[PDB]
Design a protein around this ligand. Sequence first.
Ligand code: HEM
Ligand code: HEM
Ligand SMILES: Cc1cc(N)nc(CCc2cc(C#N)cc(CCc3cc(C)cc(N)n3)c2)c1
Ligand SMILES: Cc1cc(N)nc(CCc2cc(C#N)cc(CCc3cc(C)cc(N)n3)c2)c1
Ligand SMILES: C[C@H](O)[C@H](O)[C@H]1CNc2nc(N)[nH]c(=O)c2N1
Ligand SMILES: C[C@H](O)[C@H](O)[C@H]1CNc2nc(N)[nH]c(=O)c2N1
Ligand SMILES: [Zn+2]
Lengths: 411, 407
Amino acid sequence: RFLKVKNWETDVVLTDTLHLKSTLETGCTEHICMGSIMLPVRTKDQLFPLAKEFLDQYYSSIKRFGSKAHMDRLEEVNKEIESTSTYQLKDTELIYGAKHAWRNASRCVGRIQWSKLQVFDARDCTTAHGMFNYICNHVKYATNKGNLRSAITIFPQRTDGKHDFRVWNSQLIRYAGYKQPDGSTLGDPANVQFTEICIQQGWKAPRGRFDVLPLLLQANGNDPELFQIPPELVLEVPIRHPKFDWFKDLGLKWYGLPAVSNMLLEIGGLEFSACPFSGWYMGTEIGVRDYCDNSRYNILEEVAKKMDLDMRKTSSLWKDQALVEINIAVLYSFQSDKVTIVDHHSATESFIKHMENEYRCRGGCPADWVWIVPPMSGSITPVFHQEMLNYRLTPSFEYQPDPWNTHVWKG
Amino acid sequence: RFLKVKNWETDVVLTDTLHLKSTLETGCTEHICMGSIMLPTKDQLFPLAKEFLDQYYSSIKRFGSKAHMDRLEEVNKEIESTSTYQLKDTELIYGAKHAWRNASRCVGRIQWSKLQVFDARDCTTAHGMFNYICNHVKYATNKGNLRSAITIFPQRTDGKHDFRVWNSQLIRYAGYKQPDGSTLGDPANVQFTEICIQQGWKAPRGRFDVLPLLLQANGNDPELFQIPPELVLEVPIRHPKFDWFKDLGLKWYGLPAVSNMLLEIGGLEFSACPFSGWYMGTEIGVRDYCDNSRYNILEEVAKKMDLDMRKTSSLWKDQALVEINIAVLYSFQSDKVTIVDHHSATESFIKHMENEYRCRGGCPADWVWIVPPMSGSITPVFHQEMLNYRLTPSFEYQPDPWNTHVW
Ligand code: HEM
Ligand code: HEM
Ligand SMILES: Cc1cc(N)nc(CCc2cc(C#N)cc(CCc3cc(C)cc(N)n3)c2)c1
Ligand SMILES: Cc1cc(N)nc(CCc2cc(C#N)cc(CCc3cc(C)cc(N)n3)c2)c1
Ligand SMILES: C[C@H](O)[C@H](O)[C@H]1CNc2nc(N)[nH]c(=O)c2N1
Ligand SMILES: C[C@H](O)[C@H](O)[C@H]1CNc2nc(N)[nH]c(=O)c2N1
Ligand SMILES: [Zn+2]
């Protein structure tokens, strides 16, 4: 079955056959599309098919499908599962696995970069302290004094689901939010709940507007424990504007390393529940969402007040105007400090080239339009006019419930 | 089977039950999502009729009653004999209003119940059609105080006797191929503007030339008509702060009036049914002026603001985009032609969703089309989960007639 996508700006039509390798589900039916819904212990029984599916992919990719080496690895994995109920990936499989989870990540605009990923194998880790050390090294390597490199750190896989490695932070670096008794928030309102957990656990809160949260780390299903990332490892950029001099007096800064720590990496049926990965920012992830969501830093008011915009009728487009200046400032602040960053025009163009190369060379490119198009200026970036097909390939990154909801407290 | 939708800014959760009364297909499977794709006998007509008449008699609190059963029998008889049926006026008004209520791609639907329906089912020629359309345009324009309306020409019979409006909108600017190599006017209509010339259009060759109507009645060859210029309310565009703006000499029309769609009520197909409401500002400023495919005037503008056009990262496209849109909105409001900004339109649609969950058990919404093509995440719809499903009565795309017409 052939599926076709069109670009309405250029009339380029592409053909997807890759959807024919699709495994998991979308949440969509013939009767409903759930394309805009955010969220739409395993036995031998299901594991070997998945193992086999993976090893077939791997061995195709390295040009060895049906080789001795391939048949041997198959039998070897077979035995290990029948003998222990699980199995272990070779280094090369792990690497290939993590690279493809990113390649298959349909909500990610950054995938032109997919082959350049530094994989750190933390599968010998046994304690939270070991976890901390691995993460610090991750952050230092990735940061690279502002010349960011993509990386991921992979901790031991799930066994019985009672011995899980988890990183309780949703990103390795993030600011505290503190709900006040007057009902207002200090710092980042996205992180209030997790900030409370940290305090509960015994973090001493500086109670500032930009406090870097401490890592909260669970090893081998144990209760998790706290650790401050050394401040010298945390690259930050003060936010200033090129024409606007009052902007710095807003007292804003942001960290340079986006590092997602809360997802689950699935490779050949195995489940890696701590696999923090990091890249570099698209300006709009800070400029639009972090500063200008209402449920976030919500600084459009202040930028607008200070810009002396007409704020009496929404149709002055005063919000639209402030939003642009803030994003101008974000790109400008990062670039002056030589901290790697991409603007949304650049990132979408690259992604369209990636996507076409993926169709030509791989037979498709799962793409989630709701997440790929940027959250400002949608229609003047070329992704807006691009038809995309969304589907789930493995290896993959998955959401997983927050650990404070599922953890049995050992005390 | 009871589906939840969450807003991520307000944490408000809604429960959709209306989707189980859902009829047609989406395009998507549990394997592949087609959300971002633009276009994904009498033995069959009676169920369709009944489905409709049941919802009609239910809406007037007269479900399972004498009049109800009487009507279902009458339509059954008419189908068995004639192979089609005719809608009562009341059913007509209800069907049209609901095709708009079910339009999953329309941010504007808080307005659904205030629609003026013009019954043109007695129409028989292209001249007739033209008269009905002039009257629609005049009524809906209302010297700037725009009012929603729809004009419904006769339903499909055997499919060789179709009424069609060949224009995609009643009112649109011409677009001509150029020796130079660039495109003159509006490039979206190039093919259409040529077919006009070819049937004999008096093309004046300009950049804002209102296209002639091109009307087919009862399956016959189509005919040309110039909407009286005095019926087409246009707006010169100017900036509230940039005095040089006017020198671009931009104008846009007040009336958006979709005319290439099909209206399905109770199994019947009304293939000529142009409808109109009023513009959201971004429809003109973001898309009409700034698309590569369209007037593409960002480059020309940004220069006048003297912005650093050297690097994408100065966000010069974004800066200019905003001022262009401030200007469209400003002009319309100053010439007193109805217009809505995206902040207000999206806010209104959230109020509308709430209502439709409360009162109907849901509201099919297509997020890809609802979120404005600029400033998405600062409008409330961005954070709003939506379910997309096809209800009836409804509007549908149909082939451009020229790719289908027996000429
Ligand atoms: C090269 C730098 C990168 C850039 C500029 C980039 C860009 C982005 C952006 C803007 C998003 C959406 C964020 C949002 O909508 O809130 C995203 C999503 C995502 N990206 Fe990337 N990305 C990069 C590298 C990576 C890497 C290294 C990985 C992992 C190997 C990754 C995996 C993902 C995943 C799983 C999502 C979706 C997360 C979710 O569903 O919540 N990206 N990407
Ligand atoms: C009253 C003010 C109205 C506003 C502000 C409005 C707004 C919009 C917007 C912004 C779109 C997006 C389409 C695009 O970007 O091209 C749209 C599409 C649509 N609206 Fe409305 N609308 C209005 C009235 C109406 C009326 C009167 C009807 C029908 C009775 C209608 C039915 C539709 C349909 C069917 C679409 C999708 C058309 C397509 O698939 O191309 N709307 N509307
Ligand atoms: C490596 C990398 C590089 C880069 N430039 N950007 C990213 C994505 C980062 C991200 C940040 C936030 C925030 N704040 C939320 C998110 C999504 C939060 C979320 C929330 C929910 C409810 C579900 C779900 N799947 N995801 C992602 C990653
Ligand atoms: C009544 C009303 C009010 C209002 N404010 N806006 C509308 C939509 C009008 C419209 C504008 C464009 C454009 N540009 C394209 C279109 C059609 C774009 C299109 C194109 C194709 C190929 C299929 C399809 N379903 N739609 C419509 C209507
Ligand atoms: C492929 C993609 O869905 C397509 O370009 C859509 C996206 N969203 C849109 N949204 C609106 N309102 N109007 C459009 O024309 C489009 N185009
Ligand atoms: C409800 C809606 O699906 C949700 O808020 C999505 C929309 N698109 C998004 N797109 C990106 N890139 N990131 C997001 O968090 C979201 N949020
Ligand atoms: Zn879908």
